[PDB]
Write a protein that binds this ligand. Structure first.
Ligand code: EN8
Ligand code: ZN
Ligand code: ZN
Length: 177
């Protein structure tokens, strides 16, 4: 197995996948690494198995159909994996914890949103459709771009949103256009 966490790229107390070489800090994996389980397979492996069991799941889909899906276990897992792929980018640090807004010439967003809040909402089964999760993720970046205006720091939101959108299209097999 790898000697660093797949998500944050640091060493520490690591839990090793039994079916691939990846390793994870307990709370960097999503869902958090399960207490007792041998063998244990990581979320990458679990997502791959869904693909293998149903190869046609990789055929192109319409975004509007994906968003309307209820959060059954496979969709729950795909949203957990999509969230994890955002945390895998080191620029996710800017979006992880609860933000605050005090900048001359700007007003904070009406509905603040951040990755750890989305992580909690998934863990608590608060989303009934894919749409709820995707709307909260897009809101994180939209709030950032509106607040920072012409400050070049706006670009961090564009960059992390692009990682989110590329992973969304791949994980949910959105039809290429
Ligand atoms: C959809 O393909 C999977 C399940 O997820 C990915 C998501 C983003 C990117 N970039 C690549 C991915 O490759 C796979 C095979 O995981 C390793
Ligand atoms: Zn980690
Ligand atoms: Zn694995």
């Amino acid at each position: 197995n790898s000697n660093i966490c797949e998500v944050c790229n640091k060493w520490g107390r690591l839990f090793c996948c039994d079916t691939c070489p990846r390793s994870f800090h307990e709370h960097c994996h999503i869902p958090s690494v399960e207490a007792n389980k041998n063998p244990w397979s990581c979320i990458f492996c679990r997502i791959k198995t869904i693909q293998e069991r149903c190869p046609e799941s990789q055929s192109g889909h319409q975004e509007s159909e994906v968003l309307m899906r209820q959060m059954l276990p496979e969709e729950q897992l795909k949203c957990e994996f999509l969230l994890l792929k955002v945390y895998c980018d080191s620029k996710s640090c800017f979006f992880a914890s609860e933000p605050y807004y005090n900048r001359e010439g700007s007003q904070g967003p009406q509905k603040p949103m951040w990755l750890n809040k989305v992580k909690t909402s998934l863990n608590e089964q608060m989303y009934t459709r894919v749409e709820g999760f995707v709307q909260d993720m897009r809101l994180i970046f939209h709030n950032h771009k509106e607040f920072y205006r012409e400050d070049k720091f706006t670009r961090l939101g564009i960059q992390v949103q692009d990682i989110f959108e590329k992973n969304f299209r791949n994980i949910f097999a959105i039809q290429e256009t």
